Design a protein around this ligand. Structure first.
Ligand SMILES: Nc1nc2c(ncn2[C@@H]2O[C@H](COP(=O)(O)OP(=O)(O)OP(=O)(O)O)[C@@H](O)[C@H]2O)c(=O)[nH]1
Ligand SMILES: Nc1nc2c(ncn2[C@@H]2O[C@H](COP(=O)(O)OP(=O)(O)OP(=O)(O)O)[C@@H](O)[C@H]2O)c(=O)[nH]1
Ligand SMILES: Nc1nc2c(ncn2[C@@H]2O[C@H](COP(=O)(O)OP(=O)(O)OP(=O)(O)O)[C@@H](O)[C@H]2O)c(=O)[nH]1
Ligand SMILES: [Mg+2]
Ligand SMILES: [Mg+2]
Ligand SMILES: [Mg+2]
Lengths: 62, 161, 67, 161, 162
């Protein structure tokens, strides 16, 4: 009876723990990917700048 | 035109092979995916954001956390794996009946068609329990990922639907 | 037999922890969804930049051939 | 060199203004941030990935989920908002006492120094509880985010530490 | 009025004697470098400060330690226009406060000579004196100009309040 209140909260506790663990794994994977993508975007923007300047220098020579 | 694609299926089915054959134009070496891959593939003026999520049994419970905003599901099946085609059916119907996935267009890649005794589309259709589903847009497309056979026909259907 | 005061402490402990866990599940779901949206946005933006690089590199090639 | 930066502070402190002043070189119009902004800012040989997360009261519980991998905290304070300085103190100490934030270096932008009624850094040293922070590496930088005054000085401190 | 023993230290030329007499006499006086010490009593907000100003020239700094015992507050004065010697000031500050006989003293730092162009501000002083590294001590940085008196009573206020 008094044991029943406690058991039911405990069961609920274990499901919440499970989903929190799963969400944390996914969330952390997602953060890593955002950080990677922002850096990659930055590198590409720099690369694009350098090639665009190289076009104008080739047009100047030509 | 933008479409968010979630690409699921059991481990070893060919998901990552398909993703990078489409993105990089060649069959690259793959290991079982921990986490996910995501790339934008443009074909027919439509820009597909394709999420490729690891299909190992251990990490399949994680798939549901990637459903948000999905407009099309690609479910990849290893057609030479008869021992797991029913496991694949169970996983498919799990996915499509989720609230976040109920409006999603369904493309099946009947993959690994190159192998000797591999199941045909209409058999894959039957084995995956799609036949009697009249309420959802679905299609079974035969494919070979490592050669790129069938892959762009798959995307054509997604663009069409 | 277990003391009522212990059972009460454990009930209170679990109510607090389950409330906290529910809040963080909700929080994590929100953060995950925000992160997914950003990944999609960044992947698209990266692709636009790859396409722009390839377009300019092709022009860079034709200008080297014309030189 | 690479540094992951998390930028926190109460709503209206000036976090997004700072991010885009650094990134774009201009003062942009903003509204309260829902979710986050993230930009790569390059300065003095260091590539800062700066995460700017919304600081409205009801979304502060979201902050702790962005802590993972943070190497530097930027905490932004509206130095004219006298009525909320104690609130800012409470939030700052909650952040730095979290297990995932224990090793982060701490840059505090004492922001909105352009305002006639803005408090100076020395006026804030106990009101923000800074003098009682133990065993950490922290620094206060006066700033005006709209003009960019103080921002590169703050970034220099981060690079030096 | 409660009594409080104050030790005022800092590098030579920091402004200690200037501060002492500004507080004691209420007027700006010309100084010479201090060999030995000055001591004056100043009353403010119901506290009687007994302030010992001890010469800061390098070769007499070892004498500072003779004044540590009984000290309830340290005033450490820094010339904020002297960037070349800020590292030396940091070294001396940490030497003082780490002494067993100074462990219970509260610490007021006068960031002095704020009137001078390009003088280091309190926030810069915090960094250059390595204040972030101080553990289990009560400290505060007060900007000041000892020639005008600006900031000095704000400093004494902090001491009275602590
Ligand atoms: N013969 C043949 N092999 C394929 C085909 N597609 C993929 N493969 C191979 O199947 C193996 C597994 O492919 P993956 O792409 O890594 O499988 P996956 O679906 O991404 O598996 P997970 O990462 O665990 O989810 C690899 O050795 C691939 O080379 C195909 O169409 N035909
Ligand atoms: N006068 C003055 N206004 C500023 C300064 N910095 C930011 N602001 C203004 O303060 C307001 C809020 O700035 P935001 O950058 O949006 O604040 P935030 O910290 O990102 O707020 P949240 O998105 O809610 O977390 C805007 O109107 C800014 O223009 C400053 O240095 N001086
Ligand atoms: N411009 C400016 N000069 C100051 C200030 N405070 C002190 N001085 C000057 O700095 C010089 C040195 O001041 P002192 O009070 O003699 O320095 P001290 O710390 O007692 O030096 P020692 O006796 O060697 O320990 C004097 O010429 C003062 O007038 C200030 O706030 N601004
Ligand atoms: Mg894979
Ligand atoms: Mg904002
Ligand atoms: Mg003197």
């Amino acid at each position: 009876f008094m044991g029943r209140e406690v058991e039911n909260l405990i069961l609920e506790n274990t499901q919440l723990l499970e989903t929190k663990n799963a969400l944390n794994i996914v969330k952390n994977d997602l953060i890593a990917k955002v950080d990677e993508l922002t850096c990659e975007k930055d590198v590409l923007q720099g690369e694009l700048e350098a090639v665009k300047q190289a076009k104008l220098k080739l047009e100047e020579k030509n | 035109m933008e479409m968010r694609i979630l690409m699921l299926g059991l481990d070893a089915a060919g998901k990552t092979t398909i993703l990078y054959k489409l993105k990089l134009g060649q069959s690259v070496t793959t290991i079982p995916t921990v986490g996910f891959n995501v790339e934008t593939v443009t074909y027919k003026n439509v820009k597909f954001n394709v999420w490729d999520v690891g299909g190992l049994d251990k990490i399949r419970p994680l798939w549901r956390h990637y459903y948000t905003g999905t407009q099309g599901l690609i479910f990849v099946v290893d057609c030479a794996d008869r021992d797991r085609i029913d496991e694949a059916r169970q996983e498919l119907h799990r996915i499509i009946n989720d609230r976040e996935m109920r409006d999603a267009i369904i493309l099946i890649f009947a993959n690994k068609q190159d192998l000797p005794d591999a199941m045909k589309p209409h058999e894959i259709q039957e084995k995956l329990g799609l036949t009697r589903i009249r309420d959802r847009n679905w299609y079974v497309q035969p494919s070979c990922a490592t050669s790129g056979d069938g892959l762009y026909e798959g995307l054509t259907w997604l663009t069409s639907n």
